[PDB]
């Protein structure tokens, strides 16, 4: 009985491969060789935020492009003002190990999570003047690796037990669970219109999900090892992934295959962060050799290097108006970079 | 424009208060030692997804973190423990003729030793359950001989310190296991970390704490001596 099902699966895989091959008329590197290269992108360090005690492990920007939030491994969640370097808030957590944080688009709530299998939601209005714990969401059976806000009353979480979940905050229940992976899930990205999202796991695969219904629609596989980061293109028709084989890749949704691979022979280290610019021309990647690289998304050639850190680079972010880039590393320092 | 001056004053006040609080927390952070307890529930009493235990010996504070709420894929969270003082490793031994457990213990230790982000962390080794070895060696069938064929050509070291009232076979088996564990760690390290082995029985209310204390003292003493070119 098992053999028949295996043969059917093999036939279906052959069908998928043949259909994918049928549409590969040309390549991105042939009809994109009549465009002027951007040149050399040289950036300078404008600020430097100090005050953490251990390795910064995650970072997220705000919608006003002025306030930011940082999570440290000693049990601190700090809210910073970037123009003036002042600290606005500091919150201590119950459990020291934290692996993610978020910042609501409205500006009122913050979210935190880590190795305790619980997502904590904190309130920032605080008419009495004290930042207190507003909600605790429990129900996963593995450590929590990412969390993003949909509105002030919904949230999406990724766990290391091969599952994703959607939560309503007032009641504290799981409306829908997305299952179907084979290893730990590491990152997730939300579309601009908030009706789909992508997931990337430790089995060299990525998946696309629809929030309202609750089933998978496409599965993408071109990588050789684990995937650690993922991010959409600005128009919601493509995304880019970084992995542990020293190679980034770009996938498109209406064609259902890969378009371009970024890699070089001098690099033998993994990738921990990816992000696009505002217009979708530059691609920023963070590596384990202590510096970040700036690639040209339409030519696959290196364009610049940001080298200012003394340890492993963990988190990378780009604002909404595209006026600065923030980097955070294991040396307990945040840096803001800008051009001139 | 008095509003701008008032806003600047308020921001400076909040900044000063927050910085004072962080300066007060820094000392408490730096006057504590973190330890990771790993196996391959009874020991934790001798000293939720993750369990935290706090104790104090000779006016020194010790953390302990037990991770039993996770799965058996370890390659991703083991990386978040690269700044601990020691790793406490607990193994279970046996000598009764279904699955080779010593082999998987050895393989996991070998993987931990050579990992890139854990190349500067020492290991404290507890060879738990020595009573089962004594119980199973009297059966006349040697499981150690069944799984390890190099046990026959083994002689007890000259510096043995057996306990009074032990069959020589039990001691020879124990020292065989200890030598197996030391042979892995004396082939990779350049001088940045070591390994400290111990025996117990299947009762460490006032025993585990003292040994952990002494081992941590040794670790930090060597760390400081090596920086001045004295070791």
């Amino acid at each position: 009985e098992l053999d028949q099902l295996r043969q059917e699966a093999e036939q279906l895989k052959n069908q998928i491969r043949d259909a994918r091959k049928a549409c590969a008329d040309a390549t991105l590197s042939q009809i994109t060789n009549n465009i002027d290269p951007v040149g050399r992108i040289q950036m300078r360090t404008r600020r430097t935020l100090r005050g953490h005690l251990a390795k910064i492990y995650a970072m997220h920007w705000g919608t006003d492009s002025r306030l930011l939030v940082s999570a440290s491994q000693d049990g601190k969640l700090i809210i910073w003002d970037s123009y003036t370097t002042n600290k606005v808030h500091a919150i201590p957590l119950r459990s020291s190990w934290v692996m993610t944080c978020a910042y609501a688009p409205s500006g009122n709530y913050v979210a935190c999570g880590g190795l305790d299998n619980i997502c904590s939601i904190y309130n920032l209005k605080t008419r009495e003047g004290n930042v207190r714990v507003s909600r605790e969401l429990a129900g996963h059976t593995g450590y929590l690796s990412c969390c993003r806000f949909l509105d002030d009353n919904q949230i999406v979480t990724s766990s290391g037990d091969t599952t994703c979940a959607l939560w309503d905050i007032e009641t504290g229940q799981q409306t829908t669970t997305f299952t179907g992976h084979t290893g730990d899930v590491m990152s997730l990205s939300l579309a601009p219109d908030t009706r789909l999202f992508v997931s990337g796991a430790c089995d060299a695969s990525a998946k696309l999900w629809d929030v309202r219904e609750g089933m998978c629609r496409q599965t993408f596989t071109g990588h050789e090892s684990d995937i650690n980061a993922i991010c959409f293109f600005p128009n919601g028709n493509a995304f880019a992934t970084g992995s542990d084989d020293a190679t980034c890749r770009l996938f498109d949704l209406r064609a259902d295959q890969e378009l371009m691979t970024y890699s070089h022979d001098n690099i033998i280290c993994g990738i921990t962060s990816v992000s696009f610019s505002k217009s979708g021309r530059l691609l920023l990647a963070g590596y384990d050799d202590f510096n970040c690289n700036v690639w040209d998304a339409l030519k696959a050639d290196r364009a610049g290097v940001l080298a200012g850190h003394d340890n492993r680079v963990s988190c990378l972010g780009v604002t909404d108006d595209g006026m600065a880039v923030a980097t955070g590393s294991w040396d307990s320092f945040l840096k803001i970079w800008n051009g001139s | 424009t008095e509003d701008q001056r008032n806003e600047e004053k308020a921001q400076r006040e909040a900044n000063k208060k927050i910085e004072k609080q962080l300066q007060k927390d820094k000392q408490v952070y730096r006057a504590t030692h973190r330890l990771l307890l790993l196996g391959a529930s009874t020991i934790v009493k001798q000293m939720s997804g993750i369990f935290e235990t706090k104790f104090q010996v000779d006016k020194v504070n010790f953390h302990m973190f037990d991770v039993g709420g996770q799965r058996d894929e370890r390659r991703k969270w083991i990386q978040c423990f690269n700044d601990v003082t020691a790793i406490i490793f607990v193994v279970a031994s046996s000598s009764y003729n279904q699955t080779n457990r010593l082999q998987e213990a050895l393989n996991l230790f070998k993987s931990i030793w050579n990992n890139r982000w854990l190349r500067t962390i020492s290991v404290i080794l507890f060879l738990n359950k020595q009573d089962l070895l004594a119980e199973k060696v009297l059966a006349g069938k040697s499981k150690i001989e069944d799984y390890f064929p190099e046990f026959a050509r083994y002689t007890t070291p000259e510096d043995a310190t057996p306990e009074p009232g032990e069959d020589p076979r039990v001691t020879r088996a124990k020292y065989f296991i200890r030598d197996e564990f030391l042979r892995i760690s004396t082939a990779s390290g350049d001088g940045r970390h070591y390994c400290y082995p111990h025996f117990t029985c299947a009762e460490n209310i006032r025993a585990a704490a003292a040994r952990i204390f002494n081992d941590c003292r040794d670790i930090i003493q060597r760390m400081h001596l090596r920086q001045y070119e004295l070791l």
Partner: nanobody, 128 residues
Framework: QVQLQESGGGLVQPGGSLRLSCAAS????????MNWVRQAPGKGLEWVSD????????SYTGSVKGRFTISRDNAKNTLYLQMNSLKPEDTAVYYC?????????????????????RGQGTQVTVSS
């Protein structure tokens, strides 16, 4: 797509010999350590043997030492195991396993809960 396949198996009389071959597709074969794993009826997974990128670091388990041999060919992308002088306690299902990341010295690849990079295995039986 990472894909691994195993071939060679069946029933042999005690004291016989047999050969197992493992074919790979989807990755650069010569950057990864590779190893052989085995599962017996009614037990858990256990590690049999392992071999490195070039062929200068070969390691076996205790019970099969002196009877089994490991080898790899990087031009044809294949891994071989040679089984000699079998005993009845060797009847099992054999799997070909790959270590998760390139250019490393460590592996974490005996996990039962559906480790990604290994195949479906072959059946070996020894009896009268």
């Amino acid at each position: 797509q990472v894909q691994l396949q195993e071939s060679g198996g069946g029933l042999v009389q005690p004291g016989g010999s047999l050969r197992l071959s493992c074919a790979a597709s989807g990755f650069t074969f010569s950057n990864y350590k590779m190893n052989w794993v085995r599962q017996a009826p009614g037990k858990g997974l256990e590690w049999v043997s392992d071999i490195s990128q070039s062929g200068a670091s070969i390691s076996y388990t205790g019970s099969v030492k002196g009877r089994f041999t490991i080898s790899r060919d990087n031009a044809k992308n294949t891994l071989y195991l040679q089984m000699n002088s079998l005993k009845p306690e060797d009847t099992a299902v054999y799997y070909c396993a790959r270590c998760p990341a390139p250019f490393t010295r460590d592996c974490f690849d005996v996990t039962s809960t559906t480790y990604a990079y290994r195949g479906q295995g072959t059946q070996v039986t020894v009896s009268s």
